[PDB]
Design a protein around this nucleic acid. Structure first.
Ligand SMILES: [Mg+2]
Ligand SMILES: [Mg+2]
Ligand SMILES: [Mg+2]
Ligand SMILES: [Mg+2]
Ligand SMILES: [Mg+2]
Ligand SMILES: [Mg+2]
Ligand SMILES: [Mg+2]
Ligand SMILES: [Mg+2]
Ligand SMILES: [Mg+2]
Ligand SMILES: [Mg+2]
Ligand SMILES: [Mg+2]
Ligand SMILES: [Mg+2]
Ligand SMILES: [Mg+2]
Ligand SMILES: [Mg+2]
Lengths: 63, 178, 261, 145
RNA sequence: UACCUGGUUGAUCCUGCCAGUAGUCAUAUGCUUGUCUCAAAGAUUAAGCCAUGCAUGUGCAAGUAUGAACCAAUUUGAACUGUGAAACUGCGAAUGGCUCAUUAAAUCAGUUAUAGUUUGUUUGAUGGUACGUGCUACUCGGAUAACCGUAGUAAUUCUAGAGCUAAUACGUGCAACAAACCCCGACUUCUGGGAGGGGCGCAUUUAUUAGAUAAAUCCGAUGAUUCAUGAUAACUCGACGGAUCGCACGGCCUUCGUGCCGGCGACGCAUCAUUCAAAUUUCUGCCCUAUCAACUUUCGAUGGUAGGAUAGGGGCCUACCAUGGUGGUGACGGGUGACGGAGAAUUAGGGUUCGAUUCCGGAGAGGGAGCCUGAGAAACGGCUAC
RNA sequence: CCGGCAUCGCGCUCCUAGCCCGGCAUCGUUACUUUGAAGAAAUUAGAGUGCUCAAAGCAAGCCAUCGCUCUGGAUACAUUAGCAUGGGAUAACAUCAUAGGA
RNA sequence: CCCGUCGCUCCUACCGAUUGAAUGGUCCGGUGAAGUGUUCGGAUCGCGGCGACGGACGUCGCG
RNA sequence: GCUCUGAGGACUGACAGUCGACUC
């Protein structure tokens, strides 16, 4: 059954420590300023940003 | 049925080798021919892998025997097996089987050696100046029946072929037979 | 299994066929032919995928049994024919010739030719040795066989075969200093002039090559295919003259392409 | 004569012994000369294989075995057979978790021609032939004692 | 995001575990669900059982049609013209597809090998003599489906008999020089001969022989071969060497005679090469267990020889001889809720766990075993037995 | 960073072999490392591309968006075992005092 | 603070006469379907030679 | 039961000559 072979993955990962005032307020700041539908929307951005930053870091390790 | 797979054998260390396939055809064996030496020549077809043919020689009396020293290869009639280095049971039951010692006519060979006006003797005298004829192959013609070694695979190719013994091999087999 | 496997599913179809992943389960499975079915290109992939002369399986079937398509100069009704390196495809309805050549990335291109540079093809010899009654003959990698070969022609050499007299017209002795066009491995596509050939007892003999613009590589004797004696090849090389260039340069060329547009 | 030790008269195939027109420098295996062959791969035939009396359908230099495939080196580990030894290929295995090496070993049966002469624990170089038995696939081509 | 927090105490600092926190292309279920794209879905247990219906058949200009129909329809010679169903012959059904029961150096993976082998086909090349006393080939057979007709049985692609008719089914049989080369050889003249005439396609089997050197007229390959191959003596109750089928008409009389002709194709037969393959194979690589330290060997266990069998190597099997092979670097055995791999989850690095599953390799058809047809099956949408 | 070079560089007859000449074969093994070949695709990273984004996919873009042009469909990794070149510190195995040495 | 014997309730495993039982595999031995191969075998079926006979026969042709 | 095959020795001059009742 081809149409099986079509890849797909995720776009985010939930934060480790679910309940912190500091992280929770930072998330509410960002969601309030940029008018988001939920914090899944915020959580995608960190996933994409972490991917690119890790891409940069692996480069900067080399010469 | 019969098989040539190594599944049934034991590993080198000896541990039992579990069977993990059911037997496949490309590992088939077939019951031997025990080629007899008889008058009633009957060699029969078998259809083997690839669709080609193998001629199982169940029983023969007429074969093709070479003479290397003289480079003469005559058809002749099988008399009898006299020695086999694998199984005396095969001597007793008269199985034409590769690298046996059969005894053959010397009938085509005697008249060929009888072969070999002026143009004829002018060639005959060119020969007869190099005739060798070892005394040990010489006495065998007087006996009228020659030690020859079968060297075909009768059960495989449907022929009994071979070569007359001479030199070290003849003296050795003859010494075994006395 | 208990016999020949006659389906080839799409993801097993070799990398250089370029065919997409989700267009279906299966792949054309080249018939047992003149080329090794791993180093080939079927006629359907020629018509449908590249030239777009058809849009389906059946439409290529229509193309082929119109008797329009020609391979090595003789019409071919097969639809998974394993064409290969320097097979010529002519379409006399279009008066148009292709010769099937690699590029430096390892994929097939259809390099056009005129008629004078289409009357013949070019292929190497697998082996030259005797046959019935002691007549020499040679066997190519193209399947082709030649009887009474020119007694100088050895193994590994290359020959030109006219498509009318159907025999040799010339042969290039595989040697140091003449150009090749490697046809397998990572270096396939890259033309270049041998600078050395080292042999090892019991295994593959390798050839060191240089791209005429400097870069140097090596490949075992299997995939070399001498084209021309000396530096000049006897075949019209593709759009990029057999030079594999770094990905950095493939960036600079596209920058330079857009900055003049 | 000495070598013939069995119930059958042992001889080399396609060598014709009792030949009328004999001479000694034709090609070996011809005119009734003994057959020998050079295994290749830089190896050299043994002197006594050349001028030997033994007959063996499995000797690389005097038989019908073709050395093709791979060539291993080892040390003889047992020489208690008829024309056969067991070579111990000592080597080191890499265990990825520890970034360290553990020595393993493989005991490989090998056929020594009568020309060669191996003592227990002698360095040997062996080459692959057709399967000669249930356990033998190598012929001993070189011995360093 | 390379992270820690609650619990032993009157409190304190620790070892330390319990609990917490997060993820699963990881399963079940609870509660809830408005929209678009995407798509897993009887694998875990029971590779246990199956109603039913389908899943492999097939016709081109090119094998066989007044055996019964349809369309053109005849000047009533000759067509079955053209379209054809049915059936015979050919080919395929050995692919796909599902599942993971078996199986722990075994399958499998990387990489080897075949000079140790078989291969429908595709593609390319190739093809003397069949007897004639080698003096250029010497003749055309019934029986058979479908159809007709007459039956058994309760029966089913269960079955008997009569009557027609075909072949690219079956069975026969015309063969191409000089005969080059080979062996016997009358008489001639003496021969280093002339030779008048008598026996020689290719495949199979066997044996002798060639397949050439080195610095002061030799000539193929491989790392390596008694190689490729040639010649010769024969051998075989020879498979083989065409009694086959389509359109397109078109130069010109030798008796103007479908006249001498000759092309484009199909199908097919054999050898070699190639291709799709396989089969066997070499090194190295697999989890826990020592409450698994000895295992294998009469009956193949390790080897040798001789042989049989196979497509082929091989203890694959037999006869004889030898007593060997493996083992603390874990043999053998035992467990696996173990098919192997590519890979999946988690991952700062190292690792830990998983891998039924759609790609590849293997295995299996309720359990075993044995086979025919065929290039290919130890086949189960084939058979035979339990 | 190296090519190439002298000192107090055991030989070369053979290919590569200079305008008498660099840089040539056979007469200890490996382990290590470097470079290369060859490495099935899908997956993994990664480029390009406005499927609207996205997870994706392997497409697609301008012409006077009038009788076709420009094309792509890269690259990377792949631990070990095996093949090969150069390095020869580090460490094993091997071994010239009977001289059977050169 | 705290230790053990004993008494009562509940859970878990242990030893246990019972030639305990069931399930499944393995080896040896007995019998052994069927297939394959082979030795004989020969129901019928093909030039239906000849008698030069009057579609009929024996001597037949080998397969 | 019958017909065989093989192994196991002595004396005399790694071979040759003669002999040998028994066991497997
Ligand atoms: Mg399958
Ligand atoms: Mg096809
Ligand atoms: Mg950590
Ligand atoms: Mg406490
Ligand atoms: Mg407290
Ligand atoms: Mg927890
Ligand atoms: Mg399971
Ligand atoms: Mg053998
Ligand atoms: Mg299981
Ligand atoms: Mg599968
Ligand atoms: Mg079932
Ligand atoms: Mg099966
Ligand atoms: Mg079955
Ligand atoms: Mg079924």
């Amino acid at each position: 059954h081809v149409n099986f072979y079509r890849n797909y993955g995720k776009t985010f990962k939930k934060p480790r420590r679910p309940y912190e005032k500091e992280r929770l307020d930072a998330e509410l700041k960002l969601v309030g300023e940029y008018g988001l539908r939920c914090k899944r929307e915020l959580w995608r951005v960190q996933y994409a940003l972490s991917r690119i930053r890790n891409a940069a870091r692996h480069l900067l390790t080399l010469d | 049925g019969i098989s040539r797979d190594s599944m049934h054998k034991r590993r080198a260390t000896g541990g039992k080798q579990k069977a993990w396939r059911k037997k496949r055809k490309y590992e088939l064996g077939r019951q031997p021919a025990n080629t007899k030496l008889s008058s009633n020549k009957t060699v029969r077809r078998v259809r083997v892998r690839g669709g080609n043919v193998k001629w199982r020689a169940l029983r023969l009396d007429t074969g093709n025997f070479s003479w290397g020293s003289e480079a003469v290869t005559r058809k002749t009639r099988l008399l009898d097996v006299v020695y086999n280095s694998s199984n005396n049971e095969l001597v007793r039951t008269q199985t034409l089987v590769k690298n046996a010692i059969v005894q053959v006519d010397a009938a085509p060979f005697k008249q060929w050696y009888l072969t070999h006006s002026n143009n004829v003797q002018r060639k005959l005298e060119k020969r007869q100046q190099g005739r060798t004829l070892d005394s040990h192959i010489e006495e065998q013609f007087s006996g009228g029946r020659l030690l020859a070694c079968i060297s075909s695979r009768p059960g495989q190719c449907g022929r009994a072929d071979g070569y007359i013994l001479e030199g070290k091999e003849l003296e050795f087999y003859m010494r075994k037979l006395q | 299994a208990r016999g020949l496997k006659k389906h080839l599913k799409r993801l097993n179809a070799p990398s250089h066929w370029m065919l997409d992943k989700l267009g279906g389960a299966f792949a054309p499975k080249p018939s047992s032919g003149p080329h090794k079915a791993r180093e080939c290109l079927p006629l359907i992939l020629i018509l449908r995928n590249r030239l777009k002369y058809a849009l389906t399986y059946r439409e290529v079937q229509s193309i082929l049994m119109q008797r329009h398509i020609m391979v090595d100069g003789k019409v071919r009704t097969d639809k998974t024919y394993p064409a290969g390196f320097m097979d010529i495809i002519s379409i006399p309805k279009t008066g148009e010739n292709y010769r099937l050549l690699y590029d430096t990335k390892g994929r097939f291109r259809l390099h056009s030719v005129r008629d004078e540079d289409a009357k013949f093809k070019l292929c190497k010899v697998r082996s030259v040795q005797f046959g019935q009654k002691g007549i020499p003959y040679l066997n190519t990698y193209d399947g082709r066989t030649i009887r009474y070969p020119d007694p100088l022609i050895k193994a590994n050499d290359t020959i030109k075969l006219d498509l009318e007299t159907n025999k040799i017209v010339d042969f290039i002795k595989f040697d140091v200093g003449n150009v090749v066009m490697v046809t397998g491995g990572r270096n396939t596509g890259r033309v270049g002039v041998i600078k050395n050939r080292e042999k090892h007892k019991g295994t593959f003999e390798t050839i060191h090559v240089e791209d005429a613009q400097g870069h140097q590589f090596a490949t075992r004797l299997g995939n070399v295919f001498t084209i021309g004696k000396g530096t000049k090849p006897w075949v019209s090389l593709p759009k990029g003259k057999g030079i594999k260039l770094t990905i950095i340069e493939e960036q600079r060329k596209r920058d330079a392409a857009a900055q003049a547009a | 004569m000495a070598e013939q030790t069995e119930k059958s008269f042992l001889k080399q195939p396609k060598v014709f012994l009792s030949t009328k027109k004999a001479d000694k420098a034709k090609r070996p295996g011809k005119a009734g000369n003994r057959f020998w062959k050079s295994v290749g791969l830089g190896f050299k035939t043994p002197r006594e294989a050349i001028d030997g009396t033994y007959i063996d359908k499995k000797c690389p230099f005097t038989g019908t075995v073709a050395i093709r495939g791979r060539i291993i080196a080892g040390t003889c580990h047992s020489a208690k057979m008829n024309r056969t030894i067991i070579v111990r290929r000592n080597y080191l295995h890499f265990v990825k978790k520890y970034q360290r090496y553990e020595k393993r070993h493989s005991n490989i049966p090998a056929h020594i021609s009568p020309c060669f002469r191996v003592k227990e624990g002698d360095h040997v170089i062996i080459g692959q032939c057709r399967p000669l038995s249930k356990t033998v696939r190598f012929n001993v081509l070189k011995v360093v004692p």
